[PDB]
Amino acid sequence: FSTPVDIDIVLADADKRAMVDVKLDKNRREKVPLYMDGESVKGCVTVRPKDGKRLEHTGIKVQFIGTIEMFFDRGNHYEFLSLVQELAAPGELQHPQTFDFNFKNVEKQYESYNGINVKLRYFVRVTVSRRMADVIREKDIWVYSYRIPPELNSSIKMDVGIEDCLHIEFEYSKSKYHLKDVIVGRIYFLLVRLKIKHMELSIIRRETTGVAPNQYNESETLVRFEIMDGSPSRGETIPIRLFLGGFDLTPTFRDVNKKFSTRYYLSLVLIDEDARRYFKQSEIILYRQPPE
Amino acid sequence: ARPTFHITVGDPHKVGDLATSHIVYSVRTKTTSKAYKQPEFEVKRRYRDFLWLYNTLHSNNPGVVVPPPPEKQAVGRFESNFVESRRAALEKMLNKIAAHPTLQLDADLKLFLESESFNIDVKHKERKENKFVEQDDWFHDRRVYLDALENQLKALLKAMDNMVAQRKAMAEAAADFSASLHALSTVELSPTLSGPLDALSELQLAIRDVYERQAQQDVLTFGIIIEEYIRLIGSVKQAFSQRQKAFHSWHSAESELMKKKAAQDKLLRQGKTQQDRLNQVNAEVIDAERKVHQARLLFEDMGRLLRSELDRFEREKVEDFKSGVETFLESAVEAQKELIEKWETFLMQ
Amino acid sequence: KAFHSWHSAESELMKKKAAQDKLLRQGKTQQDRLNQVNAEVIDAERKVHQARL
Amino acid sequence: RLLEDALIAVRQQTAMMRKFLDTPGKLMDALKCCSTLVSELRTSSLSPKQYYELYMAVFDALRYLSAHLRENHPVNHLADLYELVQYAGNIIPRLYLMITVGTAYMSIDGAPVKELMKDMMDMSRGVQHPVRGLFLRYYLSGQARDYLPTGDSDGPEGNLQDSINFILTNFVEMNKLWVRLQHQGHSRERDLRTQERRELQLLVGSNIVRLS
């Protein structure tokens, strides 16, 4: 036999509309249509019958859903957006039928995310209601969030050290970088009484999930970029130029629906000849640039 | 993390003779895997624990693979090599399973690898203690196809036994051909006949060392992977069986529902039943539908799982046998190269 | 009845296929019986298809 | 032992590097294969001399790439490439990749050349390893030699001045690496340093030569 009916969802702007990729578990890349906050979502639900039989139903509806999924558990799923359009009353289907739908000016407050303990995703869900088992079809969507240049973008500049052993001033040109921006910086050496083998700059991603003492932090190290080979002396200046376009980062996400945060840190690491390791971590905000 | 699980199986605390004695290995997991607690743990597992464990993996993963175990003593003795095979067999079994995220997720296994007390006490501790043609077609297709592999695998196995057996002589023969020739070489003392004849003796010893080595080189590499497959085929025979149970429950639910429904109607159209008692039967007719709906639904997903396990199974098979062939190539050339180097040595005399 | 007869056709198919598998895992199968059992299998296979149809 | 083991590795791979290096489009390929190559030169170990030898070997192989490049840039920009390459993981590989991109930029351009050149130098304040920086700067020295901020090379937006400064920076630097070299490496390697130091001085004198 198979299914008596197959549901497909075709958008009205399906040819012209842009699509975007998502990295999922074990290097998989999905591609879905792309939307932003305030756009209308409209198209058609196409019902393809497959048998010459009849389908008794107690209603057909289409829903636009945005939801946050935590820890791979269905009981922790929270819909932050739900919109319904009823497409048909209780009845029968004997032949193919199509139904229009339009969700007017749809709010989409968060960017889509696929992480470790957290997913945030948007989809269209069509439901054909039946007496004991519904026929359900999901259709996934990417939503981006956009942001213009910030009013204030201060340089990150600091003196740090291990007392009487290593004193350094480091500088990074901004606090806020767009996803295809460049870390321009320098390291300046004030006091050096240790034997430095190499120095690297690391971009660390932290996913923070939960509320209050229920906090799980997942940490991933997305670059290790060597910026110095060998032992400097005092008065030595080391230039940093690190291109972010080589690492495909997600934006900074802060307290999203009061459930999770995704944060980015520059971690400067110096290693001595005996393999001792000296570090300083600094938060950087990553943002998605609106194209002009 | 999942494949990035690091495993040394060492420390062959080979409990000394009993004629069945069981090697206990360090299992050091150094693991950056976040599917393994400890960045390092060492446990000291004994053969029995693993075999079970291996079975456990089998048990927690319903069709979802379980490659070959720690090595069998079913041909093994207790040989360092055998135990090594075991060690290896595990290493392998483990290796793969770790680079399969799921089998690596068995909690017993986390505790097992990351705690020494054996699989057992871990295992208490963990449980806190479609159309008719279409399914029937998938069953018969699979039956013919995987019956075909098994027959082939069984035929390759009796070849492996013969191929190991028939390295013992010429090799064993040439070990005495060498002494026979060497003997008469004490009798000649005339320099350019004595000299060659001793080289020719040496040649027979050379043929002996290489011919025999090749049981162990090539045949044995294949015998291990052939055995691994037959077990894996056995294990997915269990997954199948599980699907037949689900098929059994689902029709059972359906014959029970049809009955329940029937009792309901006859009671109704007796026309002499109060709406109280009707409601008791009616409710129970609707619970039977849920029993049909839940039993069918999991039966469908069991078949999604069986498909998935198949597609997986095949994928593993392609890679495994390629490595199988590559390990053979390297060996085949090394056996022949050694004879070439030997043949020149005695061409030069 | 049409259902009863199909299902008999199917059971018959499985019996004959199961016999073939057994002849196969003796490990030497006369070619006589391999063609004969297989042929009957194929006739059973039609019977099943026609019966369903 | 050491040198040769590397050299063996070098010969196979430099051949693969070159096959890519040759080809535009696979110019990009050349860079990955190359990304694997420079690591050897990233090795911390070898004799100055042994390293020096590697320096020719890879360098020269790379010189085929530079000529290729100097054809490649005339046959199209592929924008921001200079930046883009510097995601290359570490520092000598990476840098050389920019540098090569620099060389391309010089070849078509002239006006933004100067600005870039200056960047590079700056980042060149970075190799406080005498040697890695030296060979690099040398390599570099040859790369910009044809493209120095004034007339002889070409005549950039600016001119002699920019150039002068640049060489001088180099000079100074050249003094730095070398002198630092004297004290570079393990403490008791002073004579080794002297033979070896004499070798790389020579390299320096070409610049001087450039100046005349």
- Residue B176 CB neighbour total at 10 angstroms: 12
Contact indicator for D203, D178 with CB cutoff of 8 Å: no
Axis-axis angle for helices D48-72, D190-211 (nearest 10): 30
Q: Do D83 and A231 touch (CB under 8 A)?
A: no
Could you tell me if B33 and B44 are in contact, meaning their C-beta atoms sit under 8 angstroms apart?
A: no
The pair of three-digit structure tokens given for residue B324, joined into one six-digit string: 């199988």
Q: Give dist(CA A99, CA A93) in Å, integer.
A: 13
Tokens of B296: 């069918």
A120, with CB counted inside 10 A (0-12, 13-18, 19+), is buried
Which of B65, B46, B45 is closest to B106 using CA atoms? B65
- Cα distance between residue B153 and residue A228, in whole Å: 57
* C-alpha Rg value of chain C to the nearest Å: 13
CA B244, distance to chain mean position in Å, is 23
Q: Answer for the pair A5, A47: CB distance below 8 angstroms, yes or no.
A: yes
Q: Please say whether the beta carbons of A197 and A271 come within 8 A.
A: yes
Instruction: Considering only CA atoms, give the Rg of chain D.
Output: 17
DSSP helix/strand/coil, A13: coil
- What are A156's two structure tokens? 């990150």
Interface of D with A in 185-204 (CB under 8 A): none
Neighbours of A181 (CB within 10 A): 18
Which residues have a C–N gap over 2.5 Å right after them in chain D? none
Contact A232 D128 (CB under 8 A): yes
- Which of B134, B147, B237, B244 should we substitute to test contact with C (largest number of C Cβ atoms within 10 Å)? B147
How many other C-beta atoms are found inside a 10 Å radius of the C-beta of residue A61? 17
Q: Which two tokens stand for residue D68?
A: 């290729």
Write out the DSSP string of B46-65: EHHHHHHHHHHHHHHSSSS-
Q: How many CA atoms lie within 13 A of D35 on its CB side?
A: 14
Residues of chain A found within 8 Å of residue D38, distances taken between Cβ atoms: none
Q: The tokens of B336 are what?
A: 């022949």
What's the token pair of residue A240?
């940093």
3-class secondary structure, A101: strand
* Cβ–Cβ contact D87 with A under 8 A: yes
CB-neighbour burial class of residue D187 (10 A; exposed 0-12, middle 13-18, buried 19+): exposed
Which residues in chain B touch residue C24, judged by CB atoms under 8 angstroms apart? 147, 151
Q: Does D42 touch chain A (CB under 8 A)?
A: yes
Give the residue from B346, B11, B86, B80 showing the smallest Cα distance to B203: B346
CB–CB of A79/A67 below 8 Å?
yes
Q: Quick check: A54 contacting D, CB < 8 Å? A: no
Specify whether the CB–CB gap between B27 and B43 falls below 8 A: yes
Q: Which helix (H) or strand (E) holds D191?
A: helix D190-211
CA atoms within 13 A on the CB side of B263: 15
Q: What is the token pair recorded at D87?
A: 């995601």
Contact residues for A286 (Cβ-Cβ < 8 A; gap 6+):
A176, A177, A178, A179, A244, A249, A250, A251, A252, A264
Beta strands across the sheet bearing A41-49: A5-11, A41-49, A97-103
Report d(CA D152, CA B290) in Å as an integer. 89
What is the crossing angle of helices B132-165 and B275-347, to 10°?
A: 30
C-alpha to C-alpha distance for B224 and B90, rounded to whole angstroms = 12
Total residues found in chain B within this entry: 349
**Beta bridge mates, A119:** A69, A114
Cβ contacts of D24 within 8 Å, gap of 6 or more: D68, D71, D72, D75
- Report residue B36 as tokens: 């393994």
Q: Is D93 helix (H, G, I), strand (E, B) or coil?
A: helix
Cβ proximity of B289 and B257 under 8 Å? yes
Q: Do chains B and C touch (3 or more CB pairs under 8 A)?
A: yes
Contact criterion met (CB < 8 Å) for A243 and D84:
yes
The amino acid sitting at B39 is P
Q: Scanning every residue of chain B, which has its alpha carbon at the shortest distance from the alpha carbon of C29?
A: B151
| Listed residue (B181, B163, B162) closest to B173, CA to CA | B181
Vertex B312: Cα angle to B311 and B318 (nearest 5): 95
Mutate to test the interface with A, among D84, D90, D101 (most CBs of A within 10 A): D90
User: Which of A143, A121, A120 minimizes the C-alpha distance to A38?
Assistant: A143
Using the Cβ of A275 and the Cβ atoms of chain D, whether some distance falls under 8 Å is answered with no
Chain C residues in contact with B154 (beta carbon < 8 A):
25, 27
Give the distance from residue B316's alpha carbon to the nearest chain C alpha carbon, in angstroms. 25
Chain B hits for A26, CB-CB cut-off 8 Å, are 101
AA letter at C43: D
Q: Give the gyration radius of chain A's Cα atoms.
A: 26
Q: Which two tokens stand for residue A63?
A: 């829903």
Cβ contact (<8 Å) for B133 and C14?
no
If you write DSSP's letter for every residue of A163-226 in order, what string do you get? TTTEEEEEEES-SEEETT-EEEEEEEEEEE-S-EEEEEEEEEEEEEESSTT--EEEEEEEEEEE
**Do B12 and B23 contact (CB within 8 A), yes or no?**
yes
Say whether D109 sits in a helix, a strand or coil. coil
Q: How many CB atoms lie within 10 A of CB A284?
A: 21
- Burial of D64 per CB tally in 10 Å (0-12, 13-18, 19+): middle
**Which residues are bridge partners to A286 per DSSP?**
A177
Q: Which token pair is B52? A: 């079970």
Handedness of CA A198, A203, A207, A212 (dihedral sign): positive
DSSP state of A126: E
Closest CA to B238 of B53, B57, B56, B58: B58
DSSP code for B219: I
Whether the CB-CB separation of B281 and B264 falls below 8 Å is answered with yes
CB pairs under 8 A between A and B: 15
| Residue D196 to residue D46: CA distance in whole angstroms | 12
* Rounded CA separation B268/B270 (Å): 5
Spell out the residues 6+ positions from residue D64 whose beta carbon is closer than 8 angstroms to its own.
D18, D21, D22
The answer to whether residues A221 and A279 touch, using CB atoms and an 8 Å cutoff, is no
Q: Residue C27: which region, alpha, beta or left (left: phi > 0; alpha: psi -120 to 50)? A: left
Nearest to B50 by CA among B29, B30, B71: B71
Interchain proximity A132–B134, CB inside 8 Å: no
Show which of residues 70-129 on chain A sit within 8 Å of chain D, judged by CB atoms: none
Which residue in A133, A34, A121, A128 sits closest to A77, CA to CA? A121
Chain D contact for A239, CB < 8 A?
yes
- Touch between D and C (at least 3 CB pairs under 8 Å): no
* Contacts for A77 with CB less than 8 Å, ≥ 6 apart: A67, A68, A69, A70
Angle at B116 between CA B113 and CA B120, to 5 degrees: 85
Q: Which of B147, B154, B155 sits opposite C21 (nearest CB)?
A: B147
Alpha-carbon distance B299 to nearest alpha carbon in chain C (angstroms): 21
Identify the closest residue of chain A to B101 by CA–CA distance: A26
Side-chain-side CA neighbours of residue B336 (13 Å): 7
Q: How many CB pairs under 8 A join B and C?
A: 17
- Which residues lie across from A32 on neighbouring strands? A20
Q: Partners of A68 in the beta sheet? A: A78, A120
Residue A268 near residue A170 (C-beta atoms within 8 A)? yes
Under 8 Å between Cβ of A267 and A281: yes
CA distances in angstroms from B257 to B135, B298, C37, listed in the order given? 22, 18, 40
CB-nearest to B131 from A2, A26, A132 is A2
Task: Verify whether the Cβ–Cβ distance C17 to B143 is below 8 Å.
Answer: yes
CA distance D55 to D35: 16
β-pair partners for A187: A170, A238
> Which residues of A are less than 8 Å from D129 in CB distance?
229-230
Taking each helix axis from N to C end, the angle separating D130-143 and D48-72, rounded to the nearest 10 degrees, works out to: 30
β-pairing, A176-178 vs A277-287, is: parallel
B131 with A132: Cβ contact below 8 A = no
- How many whole angstroms from its chain centre is CA B128? 29
Q: Report the alpha-carbon distance of residue B319 to residue B324 in Å, rounded.
A: 9
User: Quick check: helix, strand or coil at residue A79?
Assistant: strand
CA distance A86 to D71: 64
CA dihedral (A205, A210, A213, A215) positive or negative: negative
Which of A2, A132, A133 lies closest to B130 in CB terms? A2
Specify the 3-state DSSP secondary structure of A7. Answer: strand
In this complex, which chains have at least 3 CB pairs below 8 Å with chain D? A
Give 3-state DSSP helix, strand, coil % of chain D, rounded to 5.
Answer: 75, 0, 25
Residues of chain C with Cβ-Cβ distance to B140 below 8 Å are 13-14, 17
Angle at C3 between CA C2 and CA C9, to 5 degrees: 90
| Among C3, C10, C38, the residue to mutate for chain B (most B Cβ within 10 A) | C10
Nearest alpha carbon to residue A170 among A273, A272, A286, A270: A270
Contact D101, D85 (CB under 8 A): yes
Task: Identify whether the C-beta of residue D10 lies closer than 8 Å to the C-beta of residue D54.
Answer: yes
Rounded Cα distance between A200 and A226, Å, is 4
Question: How would you classify residue A232: left for phi > 0, otherwise alpha for psi between -120 and 50, otherwise beta?
Answer: beta
The answer to whether B60 and B119 have CB atoms below 8 angstroms apart is no
Phi then psi for residue D174, to 5 deg, are: -60, -40
| CA–CA separation, A44 and A78 (whole Å) | 26
Burial of A79 (0-12, 13-18, 19+ CB in 10 A): exposed
CB contact under 8 A, D128 and A246: no
Which chain C residue has its CA at the smallest distance from B132's CA? C52
The full length of chain A comes to: 292
Q: Which tokens go with A203?
A: 């971009």
Residue B141 to residues A72, B165, B231, C48, D193, Cα–Cα distance (Å): 35, 37, 20, 15, 75
Report d(CA C12, CA C48) in Å as an integer.
9
- Dist CA D156 CA D141 (whole Å): 17
For B99-219, where are the alpha helices, taking DSSP H only? 107-113, 119-126, 132-165, 171-184, 191-214
Dihedral (CA of D189, D195, D200, D201) sign: positive
Q: How many CB atoms lie within 10 A of CB B171?
A: 19
C27/B143 CB distance under 8 A: no
Q: CA-CA distance, B210 to B339, in Å (whole number)?
A: 7
Interface residues from chain C to B (CB-CB < 8 Å): 10, 13-14, 17, 21, 24-25, 27, 52
Question: Quick check: A242 and A187 in contact, CB under 8 A?
Answer: no
Q: How many CB atoms neighbour CB D205 within 10 A?
A: 10
β-bridge partners, A122: A66, A141
Neighbours of A238 (CB within 10 A): 21
Q: Which residue of A has its CA nearest to B137?
A: A1
Q: Tell me if A171 sits within 8 A of A185, measured CB to CB.
A: yes
| Token pair listed for D111 | 């006006």
H/E run at residue A5: strand A5-11
Instruction: Check if D181 contacts A (Cβ < 8 Å).
Output: no
Give the list of residues 6+ apart from residue B36 with CB closer than 8 angstroms, or none.
B5, B29, B104, B110, B113, B114
Q: A2 to chain B: which residues are within 8 Å by CB?
A: 130-131, 134
How far B151 CA lies from chain C's nearest CA (Å)?
7
Q: Provide φ and ψ at D107, rounded to 5°.
A: -65, -50
- Residues in B touching C21 (Cβ below 8 Å): 143, 147
Q: Distance from C25 to chain B by nearest Cα, in Å?
A: 7
D93 near D42, Cβ under 8 Å? yes
Closest chain B residue to A51, measured at CA: B131
In A112-155, at which residue ranges do the beta strands (DSSP E only) sit?
113-114, 118-128, 135-143
Beta strands of D112-208 (E only): which ranges? none
The alpha-carbon gap from B139 to the nearest alpha carbon of chain C, in Å, equals 10
Q: Which among A37, A41, A179 is positioned nearest to A101, based on CA atoms?
A: A41
As a whole number of angstroms, the distance between CA A202 and CA A207 comes to 16
Q: Which two tokens stand for residue D159?
A: 């001119």
Peptide bond into B170 cis (omega under 30): yes
For residue A245, list chain D residues with Cβ-Cβ distance below 8 A. 84, 87
Q: Are A132 and A167 in contact (CB under 8 A)?
A: no
The dihedrals phi and psi of A5, each to the nearest 5 degrees, come to -150, 140
Q: In angstroms, rounded to a whole number, what is the distance separating the alpha carbons of residues A16 and A275?
A: 55
- Sheet of B23-31: strand order equals B5-14, B23-31, B40-46
Task: Please give the Cα distance from A178 to A292 (Å, whole number).
Answer: 14
D-interface mutation test, from A173, A243, A269, A271, most D Cβ less than 10 A away: A243
Indicate yes or no: CB of B130 within 8 angstroms of CB of A1.
yes
